[model samples]
Target chain A: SVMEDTLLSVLFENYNPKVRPSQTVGDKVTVRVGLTLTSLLILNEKNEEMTTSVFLNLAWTDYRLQWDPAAYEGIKDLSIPSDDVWQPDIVLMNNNDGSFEITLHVNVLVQHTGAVSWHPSAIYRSSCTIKVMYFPFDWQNCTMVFKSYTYDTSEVILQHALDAMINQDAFTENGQWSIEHKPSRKNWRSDDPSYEDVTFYLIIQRKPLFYIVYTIVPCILISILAILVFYLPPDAGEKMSLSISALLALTVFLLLLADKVPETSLSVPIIISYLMFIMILVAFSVILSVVVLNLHHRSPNTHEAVEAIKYIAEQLESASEFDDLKKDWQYVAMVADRLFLYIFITMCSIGTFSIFLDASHNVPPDNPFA
Target chain B: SEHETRLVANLLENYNKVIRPVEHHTHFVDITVGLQLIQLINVDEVNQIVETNVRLRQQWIDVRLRWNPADYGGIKKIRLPSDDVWLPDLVLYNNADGDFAIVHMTKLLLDYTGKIMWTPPAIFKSYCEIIVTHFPFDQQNCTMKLGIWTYDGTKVSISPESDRPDLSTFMESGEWVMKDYRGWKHWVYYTCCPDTPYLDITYHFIMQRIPLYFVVNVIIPCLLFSFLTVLVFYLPTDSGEKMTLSISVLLSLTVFLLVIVELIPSTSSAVPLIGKYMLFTMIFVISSIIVTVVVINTHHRSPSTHSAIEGVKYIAEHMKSDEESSNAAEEWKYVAMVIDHILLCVFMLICIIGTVSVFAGRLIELSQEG
Candidate 1:
């Protein structure tokens, strides 16, 4: 009957917190372990996998002071007795994982004050693990072997991560995880892989339209003018001047383009070869013009019969006017024309073929070099 | 026979024979041809002699001979076509040499019609003599002075003998006149030593204008091409010919550049201004060409009516013109031309700027090296 009466009294008292302390541990220091994983949110460069390790850390020492109403509710609100007399009160202290340890140095505080608040104040270094370890991250040192193959691995890793970011929701949606991939403000060295860019942002931008404008439009315009040289009369020295001028202009651009890339690249050589090909074509045109001029200027102040025919062909739209001249210059104009044509055809065809062949030599053969 | 008998009988009777006037005059002329003092006899003495001895008596007459052209080189060969004309042989003498001799003389024969030419010969031989009086004492520090003179069609190049043996070859070298110097001011080279020990002082005077082949063929052409590249902007990019023009300009520039490079010696410490201009112009034009392509393609690629970009939008709007378009056609010509000019100017400016910067950079590098 006595035991039951005591238990009932204790249970009833537990429901209502004691206003005064019945017992006390003098000069006692109390602590609560609050463990957390600090670097869980960190990830590899590609953001595909978390390559960093977790570290446990603590803020400055938290001493519980007498609770202030503005900062927190007093311990009495938690059913602790006002007269029980805790030392300093601690609150609002947390770890990266949103957890923290609560400690009370009851012996020292009790000697100084009759009553104390539970407000926590922070202090540095109170016997806690401070070292952080990483997987592949510790080897982020300059001499690490992983950096050697970083380029090859980067693409694969990045691609996978990008696919996941675009496809899976959690990788992007979760507040716990964040990602970045951006073009660097500064340029990478020629030998360095683009993946070596330290800063990150999202998406690769393709220079599709830029490429078209830069190469295709210029090529088409130049080709047209090149063909136009054939239309221009040889008498007009304008053809030579214009053609040479155009060729020189093309060469300037090619040189500029060369400087845009690394010397180790094959692109410059191919472009230069292309420029040479065009130059040879123009040179052939010049030679042809010379030959034509010779044929036309055979007699000073007088045109040859073939020249007259050429003029006729140029002037007249009718085919009948050309009949008499079809094979007339068999020994002279025809021979000259054929010789010139042979040379022209050979130079244009062979020169272009050789240059382009050299350009394509660097290619895979399956596709034309860009 | 009777005349001869009469002459001989009279000669014996008077104890002297009268010689014919022709024989006496011929003997006098023959004696005068020799280098001897002239002996003149007075008319009275001659008459007394003639009266004393009939054999010595000859018809007294004043006679002169016409000059012959074949006889004299140092003396007048052709005489006035007149009777009683005679020319004496030219006399030359030197105190250190010998006495005066008949250097040349004309022979003459008189007939009934007039004096006629007769065979004659030059009596004396003359040669030019040159003697070297002084030279650099020590050939190690050598200097020389040369003198030359020309008259009529003959030029004598003579080198004086030098006391210094080391300067013998230099003195013997005489004159080495270059052909271009023929039409130029006489070049006076004071001191020229290719291998000077310490202070190398070289003096070279170009007698004539030196053709600046580099300027004419390379620098001028490069400038012209740079101008032409600028002109390419004037061409209608919308005509589907821009690419052709651009590429032609590039290619020609390339060939010209290649040729220019070959012309310059490989081991120059600094590039000439023209070379720099060419290379820089090439780079600028190419970059512009590429950029222009970019602008065009960007305009084409985007669905937008106006490019929000400032210069680009203006270019695109102008390019959209043909013969029929309302606004585009009205302003196309002027606008295109203006844009072309501006773009080209811009390109040129960039080129010049690049060249200047490169030059500045080289100077900096040189200073740093020093």
Candidate 2:
């Protein structure tokens, strides 16, 4: 840590000492690896194609950065030698920042001389300062911008990286992480056990708006129609038929439901059971309908029968003078159907809304690396 | 023919070991009668038919006389008995004279005083029909006997264990004596018995026209309970109670279907009586409900002045009934509504009747087979 005052000022004030290997020959560069080269980084066209800066930190938590413009000082040269052996053209776009982008093309060395095979350990670790831009600072905000890489290697390491991403540890180190573990801003989303191999998809941002059209909209319309059956008038007998018909429709949906859920263990059969129960209600409605029809059809006969009973009741009323309403079967069936439909619609609303509510309330935390 | 006669002679030679000799002749004849033999009958359960054949030369003899003779010879006595002499009791003696009927002779004779007298027994042959009876083809699989009886008009179920052999096979077996009927008999033919006797059993009477009403009424309606739901989709989404009713009916139909599936044998090829009716009803009901749901839920209503909203005029026009001119279009389309109600009720009745009748009838038929 001790340095001559003038030397420190010179190094800090300007990009001074463009020291070549000969200039630093006498000085011993103490190198400490940051992240171990446990595995190769994978590349993908959709996610991994963007510029990514993977780094090793020699001085942890120190904001200082040094650009080597060469293979990180003492990293093993696993790369194959190209046609131009003496100092392949290396370009550094911006080295003042700890992050490094290998602007110049470099070849990643293939370990085997013959056919290429992937080996994570074949690559070695080297230390460098990594400057991250826009990392998480608060609960509501985080930034993850990437840096580019170019080895210009006449080797197959780039392709191997691509393979490693898919076949090996591109996401969550092959499920080594569990979903129950709590995560914080210090770690990336992949670092959390709660967010294992699962990918973060911003469906809302993509705005695929067809779900309401396909499912919810249809359900609502049918529900309203079910309500209208009550408006058919208890004396009218249409209520029963309409209600029964609606019940049957639900059964079809239940069958179609089978097509939707996987045959494995389900959270869906519960929903199916709910639907089936509704269908049963519909069937009960038919029975009510029959009762209604019976009453409606017997209205005239009922009137006649009531006339006879009325005469007898009249004599009794003369003695007691307490006239009471004669409750008929039609009225009962009508009232029952209406009440049933009301309860049913309310139930349907509760079931559907609860599912949506549960979904929306649990908005998962955003990925820190994104 | 001669060889058959010799086999019969040998058989008869061994027959006296079990039965006493009734009538025999070494030198002279005692008495004789001639008969022309006719048919013997049996049945095949797998083929569901009755089969009969003529017993041209087959005959039998009885040593103990159970019948009172009107014109046939009544033997008076047996001349004598010796240790070496065989006493003649009954002789079914068949020779080259071409006798075809069974004969009976007894050594015990009745005098004018009704006293027992030892007489020389007489033997003769006569003509009679030998019937191995079975259920008639029309009656095959038509009747069912069960421990439980369903009381549906136009179809009646009888218990197989009842004394009414005319109704149940248990009745025919003559084991049960409590529930007998008149003018009906149950006869069973068993295999590989020494006696080869077909147990002739008689009961008091039988029911007429097995129950078909259950199949016609109960089963059909139950099946239609699901089918009518498809119509729910055809109604406007604003049609209240459409979804709830449809779903409930669907649930009910589903429960019924499950019950039926459990009732049917997985290995059986022919659909069970209840199953057929249930399936048919559910299919129709579900389809109706779906259609109704679709119609009501699609936001496809009649043309309105509001140009901002999509008019469902197209859908409404297609579903438009000819009765738009009726004053009571708002009064529930009473006629169509009434008809639909009636029809669904009728459908339910049909399913119930069909299922009960077919199931019960099958039981009865199985009873008969037993």
Candidate 3:
């Protein structure tokens, strides 16, 4: 503790936080930077933002901080508050929030060899690109770019600190997203060939169990319910209501879907098209049910019997003393019902087999457009 | 003893940090490093990058810094700053950002025999290939590789400390369950370097997603909805709610689809398991769209277009002997109702078969490469 005072007074007599560390007026100060992510706090699809707690790994050489250890009893290094030292103004390029500077003011290590390193931890909120179509099955790769605000590529070279440019030691997993892979890169956004900035990418996929239970299984069940509409007899006046209700139910699903999907017209969720198809089928069921009821109320009084099979009716009348004409009218209606039943049964079964086979037959393609 | 201070002063008499620690140009320093995992921060799915933190323990023999304990008053070891001595430049080749030093300046351990040990912590972000075949239940294998690029095998031969990385300080991830945390050593020969090889160590983490949360929230509800879909066919047309119930349930499904829309990024390459199931199920319900229509049409058939009943007359002639034969002409209503009976068994059969087939697909492409 006594030696600390002696070293502080002797080393910082001309120290200035406002000034650049280098003595040459025109020479560039090379700063090496790496991001050490400790926590993935939030990754929002709706907000298109990524937030993390990270330690900024940074280092540079400073002539003023250098010393000869023989004069100081082998004191090879000192920990100085970042506020007392000149630090680079590093900012996140894809920042979601307005604050550009790091949050904490930590200690910067000054070595006797003139090497200076400052690793300040901060909570960064950055913007990320989002595409809405994938949902729980989706994979997102978001990036955070760090560069200098006050220094250009000329005044300061924002160099990457190390290979495998990001650190995630001591990181706790994010709750909703399972991480995939993250790689850092140097991107040149300007005209300079080496006009580079540092960036770290976080790749994560949404856990699908939430979606399977909440979204997919219910849709399948609903489709099957619509098919069941055929089981109702014409006299059971509720068929119209059941069929129409299912159609409207689909609309509500569409409403809930509106907030989750982008309004862009480029591509449609395959579910939407399938939903539309079911709605039409249910609507048709409604119209046809009304006609079924009309035939159920039909009698021999208001309609004439077709002469196409008069001989069979005459034979039934002589042989059984039954009311052949009235029986014939109702018989005709029942015949219509059976035809509808079988046709729809075939339609539903074959369609289910056909659509699903097509869906799974071809896996994801290599190209988007293809 | 003041010998420790003098020893520090005596050790660095022209110790240049730029050159390799070896005494001869053609000679090499044997190096070994081990990585201890601190945490798994995040993985980016879109870009296939991994974000992690690790502690690297670098070791080598520094014969030049050797000194007899008797000359230093029995002081056997000394701790010095990292920048005061020469160090190997081990880097990650699959760097996302530019390659730079990952560690902050830490103290180096020096023994009388001249064996030097440097242990520094770092967070690494690197690119990797992440697969999502099983999705939320999927396992991720992301790796971090370290190699000596500038110093070939001739100058510094590097190897791994263990078969895998240490997890003494590993923090459990929230979304993923960790299994295999291991590593491997590689000998690479570059085209430019010709004969001399380079040594690299790759540490891999096998993390599987936790599906309990999703199964509770998502899958159970889906199972409940399956029975609800079947309820539509059980309800008779006379109930007046058959159509309504069907449509309502159908619409609710689309809503579930929408919830999923917000969760994933849209890419045609591979559909989410849940999303694919949604398409499959949605198509199943849409088939009901026509299914209902046909049923309704059958009920509403009339002599106007359904006038062809010679077949009904032929059947009437054959059935002239029953007690109801006296009322045979009115039997068409019974015929219409017969089909409704048929509809139930057929629908039940199709849905049960369809559901089994749809869910069966989930069993394939279960996890990571074996």
Candidate 4:
């Protein structure tokens, strides 16, 4: 082992480290950058998807980097600094961590059969997009891509390292979203055909409960809360108190929806439309309560002011005594709420079916991203 | 067949149905009642009566019916019509329509040891004290007091056969959820008939009504209307609709109360918890109508005439910001709005405070009943 320094010096001087392992024109190198998922770190509206995990890289090159055991006195394999070896440069093309890069330089295993097993350690905070339209039941293809800075496809050809592209066996699922890995060795070429790269396709579907527990149950329970106005007595200011509180509840739920599912999507979501319709229903109820109060509190002397309309509407009733008018107005105020009870219920049933039923027909495709 | 015929007929040859089933008149015969309920036929709320379909197992000993099993086929037991031997003239003390009875004289069984068992089909319509304070979500404590009217404690001593009624063959009730039966034996000496004290066994069937049906039908709908009355304060004083809505809700509540009346018997015994809740809300509706009248009265007071009494109006000084006394034109409107806001809060507080506490009060009442 002590005398091997001379042998190593002779080998390095004879073989140039700057040469790329040939492919297409000569022998080819296979790239295997296995990404083992450690844990799903974050998933919500506050931040886009990305996390820390195990970043492993490996490949094989036909160089003597390997040596025959008989010629070298029973030597099988040897380790050398990867700093002086030819390696594939995996670049996270669109990573926001633009302050350059830091990676731990390790060793290359030089096997006896002209194979160099090279691996490098890098903490990759890979950037991935939120391909989301459906929430809770939606899965995202968060990902990374790799290309070259110094070498082009002419000098080196890229091949898939293992059929197992992204290793997900060690992944810990999330509370809000469970992770499912679907990666492909997608080939990309520039318009000039000189620039080329390979990509890692990541897919993760969001779970429903974390959002459902906080949003849907409370919202729907409060939505049927629309017709509280009917049970009320005919009084100025009385109906306003209860309906207003129920109204404010809808506003906040809508605001919560905004916080959770807003921005980025090209189309609006089904949940937002649900609260919007119900919120307006509660709003109009409070307004109707205002009109009823006016009809109930009329004085005998003031009845002279609008008697013109009474002639057209009085056909509905022959007796227009001021006292009868006041009494009659309260009963009509009663009729308004009675009408709303059935009206709001029908609309609410239809509205919920409208919002939820469409979501029933949609789901992920078998090769959703292919 | 020959041994069985000789044993059965010889036993009844000198037996009298009117006589007590005992060795002598001095000995007290203990008859045990095993009440096997088949179906709870009906609980007539208006009549304060409970009708049950059960087979009352009455067992006693008639030593004259004894036979040696060694005589024929080792026959340990035999069935005979109950009319063949002496019987206990049993009566349920509070039988409503008629004298207590086993509806039909079914067969009785006799053992080789002279133990006689008579299980008769009974449809007992017994009187029970009706308590409605927790109606719909109510559990009633019903007592079936069984006694032998003709025989006193000296000739007949009766007791319960089991700790609870057997439900093995019981068909469940649609309206009520039967819990369990509790029984106790008692001896009584009435002032009218104080000769040998009479013995009786009391079976208490405390059962709860399955409330979900009523919750949708009466309780929840009842709750819905009460909250509407709370919002009656929201109606404006300028509109005659205040009185319109109040009188209308009052009418609706009145209809519900009529339905409640049909459901419960007329009695001064106990007020229903829901009835109390409904009554409190109706009272608020009536009071709001009176207040609306008062506000309407003050609303139309021509400021020109009432202005003469301005010197004594010092009591109206405490009204905040809207106390625009500078303009006598709308001084009445401000006071009406003040009353509107004040009455709105007062009545809402009462309606909500009265609703839940009243039901929970009956829950505590149920606990004390145990």
Highest lDDT scorer: 3
Whole-model lDDT per candidate? 0.30, 0.30, 0.53, 0.51
- Model 4 chain B: ten consecutive residues of lowest lDDT: B312-321
User: Which residue segments of model 1 deviate by more than 4 Å?
Assistant: A1-208, A233-370, B1-370
Can you list each candidate's DockQ? 0.04, 0.05, 0.10, 0.03
Model 1 error, position B240 (Å): 36
Residue-level lDDT of model 4, residues B139-246, one tens digit each, is 565666877768777877777776755244333433455557677888887788756677787867666543343344344434544444433444333332234334
**How do the residues B86-115 of candidate 1 rate in per-residue lDDT, one tens digit apiece?**
232222211112222222222243443233
Per-residue lDDT of candidate 3, residues B1-370 (tens digit):
5575676566567677776676676647888877665554555544456556566788888776676754333557755567865666767766545332246555576887778888764556656544452233445555657777687788778888886543444444333455566778898887875677879888665655433433443443244333334333333332322333444554565445445445433531232232454554465544444444554354334232113465566566456546465455444433435445635654665556455544443453333322
Tens digits of per-residue lDDT for model 4, A68-161: 3343446666776676655544445433221123343677766676666655444455445542332434434655666643344554556655
- TM-score of chain B in each prediction: 0.25, 0.26, 0.70, 0.67
RMSD, candidate 3, Å: 17.4
What TM-score, over all chains together, does every model reach?
Answer: 0.19, 0.23, 0.46, 0.42
Alpha-carbon deviation at B30 in model 2, angstroms? 99
Error of 1 at A54 (Å): 18
- Give the C-alpha miss distance for residue B355 in model 4, angstroms: 7.2
Misplaced by over 4 Å in model 2 are A1-209, A233-236, A261-329, A332-370, B1-370
The C-alpha RMSD in Å for every predicted model, in order, reads 51.2, 39.2, 17.4, 31.8
lDDT of 2 by residue, A1-370 (tens): 2334543455356532222112212332221222223433321111111122332222111112221222223232335322211121211211211222432234423222111111222222211111111111111211222111221122111111121122112223422111221112111144422211111111111112344355443344544543344445543555444534543454455334333432321221112232333344434444444343232233321214435445544665574333223334323565445554544565455545544443432243223222
Model 2 preserves the real interface contacts to a fraction of 0.14
Candidate number of the best DockQ: 3
* Residue range A200-243, candidate 1, lDDT tens digits: 22221111123425543444454455344444433243453454
lDDT of 3 by residue, A1-370 (tens): 6566666677666565545666533557777776666676765555455566777777887766666544334677778777654455445555433343464477788777767778777777665544342232334455667664334464456666444443345345545545445667877776633354566765544442454255344344544553444444344434445444544454354344433433422232222333344334433443333233333223322213457457556664685445555555544546446745653665456446435543432233212210
Error of 1 at A205 (Å): 8.0
